[model samples]
Target: SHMVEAFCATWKLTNSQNFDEYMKALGVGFATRQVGNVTKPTVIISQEGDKVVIRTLSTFKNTEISFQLGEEFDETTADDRNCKSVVSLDGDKLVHIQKWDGKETNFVREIKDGKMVMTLTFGDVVAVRHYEKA
Candidate 1:
């Protein structure tokens, strides 16, 4: 499938930055803010045919899972972000539509060797989550 082929490309995590404004917007606690600031996250994505697996490894925790194109599944964020998410495709891009208890957001990802470029936005904060291929 188109999504599978797109997901098979190399991915990279380049850089990330978080803002204090977003912390306030998300109503995140001080401890959460500190952890986000200090945490170093690594992402690894591998594709086998129509199944794609993505792993986000961090100092706090590691999250790994597999999914198929246009298929919905339950994903519990390893860091306890408490988000219910399902990923789909828009052309060749991977799109994540997530619903939390009282909020929802979207994330778009593009794969490039040694870099999985991602943009995660919620309320006022936009976090760039990047991962290197392992």
Candidate 2:
């Protein structure tokens, strides 16, 4: 039994807080940020062999990323920035770290209170996105 199995789900976004600031920290421009703010993306995660595949879908864009636990991979983010990313498990949490253009951001995702809560951190700014299983 592995912890990654518990996280596989098609999650619909319930709400988000302070995500604009989080996108700003990632160097996303004004119009893009406005579009991103209104786009409610669904996160779909699945396991393929020993790797985990994460898909984010929205009306604006879609991104699919796959990585093995503790292994690094090239990722093109929804904001169109290319980064080196890794996904690791900490207890029941999926800790995803991305680095690009000498900058870094991390997303901590875990099931909390029967919902998937993603804590996004860039520099000192932090944001939260809540999702329910669909």
Candidate 3:
């Protein structure tokens, strides 16, 4: 049961590293980057039949996207960028790929070492965020 639903829960941000640089790589402006750098967001992952909904909520901003594995959809990112996004399940990890303005990035999320970890990659920069069950 745990393995089947490893991501179906509310996860609170317990730690983060290099998120500012990650946002910078996304072309986020200075003002938004300041807010985003310190925003401790909660990630809510839910499965509804074959569809999956992922929501990131914080005082700074909130973002949500719903799709099935291998399905692509339009997404409005937290920094207010419009992008085409898709997610695929690679084993227990969710690989999120987004493309906008001819640029692309990836967010790889999984549970590891008893924690939920999200690794963000944009170009050569990498950032990480760790979450705990709420």
Query: Would you estimate the TM-scores of all the predictions?
Result: 0.74, 0.96, 0.93
Question: Model 2, 40-108: lDDT tens per residue?
Answer: 888899999987999999999888998888999999888878899999999889999999989999999
- In model 1, the runs with Cα more than 4 Å from the true position are 1-12, 19-24, 112-115, 130-134
Give me candidate 3's TM-score against the actual structure: 0.93
Clashing pairs in 1: 10-112, 10-113, 11-115, 11-116, 12-114, 12-115, 12-116, 13-115, 13-130, 13-131
Itemize residue pairs with steric clashes in candidate 3. Answer: none
TM-score of 1: 0.74
Error of 3 at 99 (Å): 0.3
Using lDDT as the yardstick, the better of models 1 and 2 is 2
Error of 3 at 58 (Å): 1.5
Q: In candidate 3, what residue range of length 10 has the lowest lDDT sum?
A: 1-10
lDDT of 3 by residue, 43-130 (tens): 8999877888888899987888889788999999877779999999887888999999999999998889778998999999999999
Candidate 1 residue lDDT tens string, 1-134? 65455555434445665644455456678887777666766665678667788876777887887887677777776446676678888876788877778787777887666356777778656877665654
Q: Which structure is stronger by lDDT: 2 or 3?
A: 2
lDDT of each: 0.68, 0.90, 0.88
As a whole number from 0 to 100, the lDDT of residue 111 in candidate 2 is 90
* RMSD of model 2 against the true structure: 1.0
- All candidates in order of lDDT, best leading: 2, 3, 1
Judged by lDDT, which candidate is best? 2
Q: Model 2, residue 12: displacement in angstroms?
A: 0.4
Superior candidate under TM-score, 1 versus 2: 2
